[PDB]
């Protein structure tokens, strides 16, 4: 294990074999588990020499060692990744994508993935240097199963970083050029390829409806719903995120998710032991209950209302907040018959129990839902029968307390129902 001083001496020797052995020693230092001396190698001015070695086509070993050494530097902080970019490594790594040695080409893919992963600026700069075409050419085979497993996983991960980081979102034509290959990877039989492809789709759908439409037009929703029921949590999490992003779009885009059969997976999703899966599944439900009345009816027909009642009754608090949003959206756009069905499933008591949470937003959300249920009660004439339900389960002496609350929205949204339905 060399010192940084000895590595500098070997690289400054102008002896190609001495530089190769010094670069390999640098690669081994940067491959330690415990505190790789990335900053020490940067301060020694070694990055420009590593980048120069990337072009030594006659010495492919020294290309590989510097690429690996630069890859570990670019995996560090934003300032350490900037040092790799400032050394001119982006066009050099893009030239390495055409290397006849798979391990060298793969190392270049890895490095560009670390660089693009820093943020939208380096992502777009990697795209401006023209990385997409050679990256895609590496996947231009009729069957992905003929490619090496690790090689395929690294390409999927790097392409996935080219899809990440809004503000700004990736360029439209870049996503356009990337998307057919990404759909191929979304159908590959490897669990890691599937996870990273799902994450990329989730990045691309985390945008305005026009971005969601590009992805939905490629027909990936049925495959996303299929991966939604996988046994691997690393696959379900990005798939559910992508599904949740799509249902934030138009009602027609939400309908494609429903048509693909997504609602049949939610009984297990809404009872998933992983807290974040329950929260994201409930958030997805809140954006489906904000849809049309025929889409709310699909939620009813799949028996999902009792599961919303359960999540509202017992879940992590952030999941219960998403459930309160789901009920408020349900009662805001639902029919009277649908709202009556919600009350018959026992929504009132867990709704009243959450009026004790010190979070001010969920109180406003719950008071909104109670108002919408009372509007359905006025149309039927049972405005008083509902008032007794809220009184019997202790909800009446929780609304009276919200009258003496500091926030001015709950201020009025508590006296209103006292004056109309109880006084």
């Amino acid at each position: 294990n060399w010192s940084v001083e000895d590595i500098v001496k070997g690289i400054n020797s102008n002896n190609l074999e001495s530089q190769l052995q010094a670069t390999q020693a640098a690669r081994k230092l940067l491959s330690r588990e415990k505190q790789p001396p990335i900053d020490n190698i940067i301060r020694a001015g070694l990055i420009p020499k590593f980048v120069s070695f990337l072009g030594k086509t006659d010495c492919s070993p020294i290309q590989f060692e510097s690429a690996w050494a630069l890859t570990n530097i670019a995996s560090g902080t934003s300032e350490q990744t900037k040092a790799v970019v400032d050394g001119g490594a982006i066009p050099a790594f893009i030239s390495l994508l055409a290397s006849p040695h798979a391990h060298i080409s793969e190392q270049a893919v890895w490095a560009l993935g670390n660089i693009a992963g820093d943020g939208s600026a380096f992502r777009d700069l990697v795209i401006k240097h023209g990385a997409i075409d050679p990256l895609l050419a590496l996947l231009a085979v009729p069957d992905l199963s003929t490619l090496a497993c690790g090689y395929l996983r690294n390409l999927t991960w790097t392409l996935s970083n080219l899809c990440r980081n809004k503000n700004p979102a990736p360029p439209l034509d870049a996503v356009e050029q990337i998307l057919p290959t990404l759909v191929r990877l979304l159908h590959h039989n490897d669990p890691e390829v599937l996870a990273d492809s799902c994450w990329a789709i989730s990045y691309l759908t985390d945008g305005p409806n026009e971005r969601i439409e590009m992805v939905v037009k490629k027909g990936v929703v049925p495959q996303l719903v299929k991966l939604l029921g996988a046994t691997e949590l690393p696959i379900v999490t990005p798939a559910l995120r992508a599904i949740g992003n799509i249902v934030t779009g138009t009602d027609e885009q939400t309908q494609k998710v429903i048509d693909a059969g997504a609602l049949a997976v939610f009984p297990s999703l809404l009872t998933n032991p992983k807290t974040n899966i329950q929260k994201e599944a409930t958030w997805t439900m809140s954006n489906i209950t904000a849809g049309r009345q025929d889409q709310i009816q699909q939620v009813v027909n799949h028996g999902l209302v009792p599961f919303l009642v359960g999540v509202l009754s017992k879940a992590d608090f952030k999941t219960q907040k998403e459930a309160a949003w789901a009920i408020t959206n349900y009662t805001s756009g639902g029919t009277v018959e649908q709202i009556v069905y919600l009350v018959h499933c026992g929504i009132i008591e867990p709704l009243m129990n959450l009026l004790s949470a010190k979070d001010t937003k969920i109180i406003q959300v719950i008071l909104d839902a109670i108002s919408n249920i009372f509007q359905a009660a006025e149309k039927l004439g049972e405005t008083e029968k509902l008032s007794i339900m809220i009184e019997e389960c202790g909800g009446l002496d929780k609304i009276e307390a919200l009258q003496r609350h500091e926030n001015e929205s709950v201020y009025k949204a508590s006296l209103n129902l006292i004056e109309k339905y109880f006084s």
């Binding site: 491959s31 690996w68 570990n72 995996s75 560090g76 992963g117 820093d118 890691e192 996870a195």
Partner: peptide, 8 residues
């Protein structure tokens, strides 16, 4: 994985 960078 959903990590920005991987070290090798």
């Amino acid at each position: 994985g959903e990590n920005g960078r991987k070290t090798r």
